[PDB]
Amino acid sequence: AAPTATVTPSSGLSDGTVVKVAGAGLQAGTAYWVAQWARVDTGVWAYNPADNSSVTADANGSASTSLTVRRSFEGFLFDGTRWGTVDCTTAACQVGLSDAAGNGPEGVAISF
């Protein structure tokens, strides 16, 4: 089963909204980082470190947790580098689950 991700709600969001993030077809036993992202340049994605969560897939490859989304946030690169302000009203933000290798379900688009 190919890994899939679900975010509810995902559209018509307000800043500080708490969304339910669910994953399926994940690698059982593997921990996934649950964060809000935005592709800010070719090959460059910045995420929101101020609101993070992580969940571990069960024996069936499923997991779920909560994530507080932000209309705008101070974006950072996964290596700890500060990127800059990301405005999700203009940029195409997403919520994603990624393992230690950077793999996982396709990011889920969200809108404010």
Residue spans per domain, the chain: 1-112
With a CB cutoff of 8 Å and minimum separation 6, the contacts of 57 are: 23, 26, 27, 28, 29, 30, 31, 32, 63
Sign of the Cα torsion 111, 39, 103, 69 reads negative
> CA dist 15 to 9, 26, 71, Å?
13, 28, 5
**Resolution (in Å) of the shown entry?**
2.0
Instruction: Spell out the alpha helix ranges (H) of the chain.
Output: none
Contact (CB, 8 A) for 3 and 23: yes
CATH number of the structural domain 1-112: 2.60.40.230
- Structure obtained using: X-ray
Contact (CB, 8 A) for 112 and 13: yes
Contact (CB, 8 A) for 109 and 94: yes
In angstroms, the CA 94 to CA 53 distance is 15
In angstroms, the CA 57 to CA 64 distance is 8
In angstroms, the CA 38 to CA 46 distance is 6
Listed residue (21, 40, 9, 42) closest to 98, CA to CA: 21
* Measured CA angle at 25 (ends 20, 8), to 5 deg: 15
- Token pair 């509810």 is found at 8
In angstroms, the CA 45 to CA 81 distance is 11
Q: Report helix, strand or coil for 1.
A: coil
DSSP lists the bridge partners of residue 84 as 75
